[PDB]
Design an enzyme around this catalytic site. Structure first.
Site, PDB file in Angstrom:
ATOM      1  N   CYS A 152     -24.883  21.186  -0.760  1.00 19.96           N
ATOM      2  CA  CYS A 152     -23.974  21.384   0.352  1.00 19.96           C
ATOM      3  C   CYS A 152     -24.654  22.238   1.397  1.00 19.96           C
ATOM      4  O   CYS A 152     -24.357  22.109   2.584  1.00 19.96           O
ATOM      5  CB  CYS A 152     -22.642  22.028  -0.090  1.00 19.96           C
TER       6      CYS A 152
ATOM      7  N   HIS B 219     -19.956  27.123  -2.269  1.00 15.28           N
ATOM      8  CA  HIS B 219     -19.615  25.759  -1.915  1.00 15.28           C
ATOM      9  C   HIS B 219     -19.240  25.895  -0.449  1.00 15.28           C
ATOM     10  O   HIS B 219     -18.184  26.442  -0.124  1.00 15.28           O
ATOM     11  CB  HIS B 219     -18.459  25.209  -2.735  1.00 15.28           C
TER      12      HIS B 219
END
EC number: 3.4.19.12
Lengths: 142, 372, 76
Positions: free
Chosen positions: B15, B320
């Protein structure tokens, strides 16, 4: 044939015998939909559509509550030909009932696209319900 | 139904790349140059053999962006690009024990590395677009006996150094572009404390400011993350960190543009009760830009907010990254890019990302020049 | 060669190094005096990262310069 017949019996009976029983026969259909979804996958596709025409044939006395309540749930379920058949009942006097249909159905239609096939049915239904300050009415009865 | 762009599906442990790319493509020159790439773009030649790896990376952005704009697509692959990056820098190519797969770090570093690559391919003239030039005076505290002027000090984004001096972004920017340098060198004295003030001498046309969130705790010997509330204005004015001369130039242009910006905001609401209409206004706006304007410079001292990278959860050691970008057609309509889950969020959702707590909070803010 | 390193707390300290020395020596020396471990350190100059395999003359890094130190963070 079976799904259409179960509904068709209820509609046909309820006009001819009296007319205060008309209100009661509406409840069977609501429960019939719940039964038909865990009973057969294929059977569900037919019974959604029959419900909207259950109302129009029998000439229920509650035209405000039931089409709008059905309509939200029936977006997930397959066969968008359901909305078209709800709107044949809902039409009543135009722009009375039909305002809520337009408002609710334009949201679910714009909001969800999941096939251009599915979109076509959803569009057709809203436009049916309205005419122009109740130009005509539809009654299945004579 | 309605027109909405596509996103990246996270492989997992990727990510840090996916989140960052989105914000960059909002930037108008950025997306343009990757599209209009030729294998004949002049390079900053002094030799070097990694110039060629830089070329390959820019092709990967171009095709990712082509996938992204076109609808025949719902997922953009980072896989070819991941392979190129792992060749390029061999720190992402290691192996974690009891966790798994290919080493995961760092949206900041990643934006730095991406601009490095683009500036090699598109020259130092492209380097100026995000690069900030300072005027640094290094001068003793009391009377000056040793002085140096640095403009060769430079950056491509601001570092807002939190030390508990933030309640607003400006304060912490101001105390991390203000500093005291202690010496360990012989003059005719030694350990003279020098006041250093860096002032911006050249605005970028695209501004990036990163919040610094990390600390090395020395009282336990373990990494922690600073958590603080910092309100960021959507409309950012950097007047106080420029020298008087440069501030005078940009603030006068800004006030005339704010007159036309006011005039639009009134006219927009009336006609309601779009792109072409903005272009009619653009031709009006460019007339108040100064005649001494140069390459790699904002015609104003004001920027508007087009991206926020947020980092959520617990510790650093974990992460994240989801992100927010502003629509390229709107100005108060924002897209939330949570990998391939793309949704419309409003101004209120952007405001809430000031942070403090385990919640979403800011690490990187992308702006761009030209008020509106 | 005297260089300046802007820490995470935004205070500038000095460091005594060489332009021929590698970034691994630079980061080792900051480890001795602050405790920070090299593989979490990132030395920035010009907005460009200076990797472990680089030195301090690849980007014309001489004295009276300030490098901007920021720290790593894992995940994905």
């Amino acid at each position: 044939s079976d799904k259409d017949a179960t509904t068709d019996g209820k509609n046909d009976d309820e006009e001819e015998e009296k007319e205060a029983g008309i209100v009661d026969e509406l409840a069977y259909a609501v429960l019939g939909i719940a039964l038909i979804a865990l009973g057969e996958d294929i059977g569900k596709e037919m019974s959604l559509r029959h419900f909207g025409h259950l109302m129009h044939y029998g000439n229920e006395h509650i035209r405000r509550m039931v089409p709008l309540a059905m309509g939200i749930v029936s977006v997930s379920d397959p066969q968008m030909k359901v909305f078209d058949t709800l709107t044949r009942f809902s039409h009543d006097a135009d722009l009375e009932v039909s305002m809520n249909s337009i408002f609710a159905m334009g949201l679910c239609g714009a909001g969800t696209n999941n096939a251009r096939l599915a979109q076509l049915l959803r569009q057709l239904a809203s436009y049916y319900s309205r005419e122009q300050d109740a130009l005509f009415i539809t009654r299945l009865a004579q | 139904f309605a027109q909405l762009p596509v996103g990246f599906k996270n492989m997992g442990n990727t990510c840090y790349l996916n989140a960052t790319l989105q914000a960059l493509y909002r930037v108008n020159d950025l997306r343009d140059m990757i599209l209009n790439y030729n294998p004949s773009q002049g390079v900053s030649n002094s030799g070097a053999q990694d110039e060629e790896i830089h070329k390959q990376i820019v092709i990967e952005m171009k095709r990712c962006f082509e996938n992204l704009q076109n609808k025949s697509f719902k997922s953009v692959l980072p896989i070819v690009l991941l392979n190129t990056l792992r060749k390029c820098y061999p720190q992402f190519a290691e192996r974690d024990s009891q966790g798994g797969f290919y080493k995961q770090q760092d949206a900041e570093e990643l934006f730095t590395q991406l601009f490095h690559s683009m500036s090699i391919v598109f020259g130092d003239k492209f380097s100026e677009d995000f690069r900030i030039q300072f005027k640094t005076t290094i001068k003793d505290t009391a009377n000056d006996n040793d002085i140096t002027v640095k403009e060769n000090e430079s950056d491509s984004k601001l570092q807002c150094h939190i030390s508990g001096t933030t309640n607003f972004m400006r304060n912490g920017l101001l105390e991390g572009l203000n500093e005291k340098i202690e010496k360990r060198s012989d003059l005719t004295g030694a350990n003279s404390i020098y006041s250093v003030e860096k002032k911006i001498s050249r605005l970028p046309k695209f501004l990036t400011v990163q919040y610094v969130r990390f600390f090395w705790k020395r009282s336990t010997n373990k990494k922690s993350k600073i958590l603080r509330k910092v309100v960021f204005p959507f409309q950012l004015d950097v007047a106080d960190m420029l020298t008087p001369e440069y501030a005078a130039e940009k603030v006068k242009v800004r006030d005339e543009l704010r007159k036309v910006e006011k005039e639009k905001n009134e006219k927009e609401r009336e006609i309601k009760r779009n792109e072409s209409e903005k272009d009619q206004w653009l031709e009006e706006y460019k007339k108040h830009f100064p005649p001494n304007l140069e390459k790699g410079e904002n015609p104003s001292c004001v920027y508007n907010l087009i991206g926020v990278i947020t980092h959520q959860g617990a510790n650093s050691e974990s992460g994240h990254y989801q992100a927010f970008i502003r629509d390229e057609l709107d100005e108060n309509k924002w897209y939330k890019f949570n990998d391939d889950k793309v949704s419309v969020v409003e101004k209120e959702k952007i405001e809430s990302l000031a942070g403090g707590g385990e919640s979403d909070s800011a690490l990187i803010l992308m702006y761009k020049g030209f008020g509106l | 060669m005297q260089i300046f390193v802007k820490t995470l707390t935004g205070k500038t300290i000095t460091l005594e190094v060489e332009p021929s020395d590698t970034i691994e020596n630079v980061k080792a020396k900051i480890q001795d005096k602050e405790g920070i471990p090299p593989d979490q350190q990132r030395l920035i100059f010009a907005g460009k990262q200076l990797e472990d395999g680089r030195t301090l003359s690849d980007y014309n890094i001489q004295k009276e310069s300030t490098l901007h130190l920021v720290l790593r963070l894992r995940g994905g």
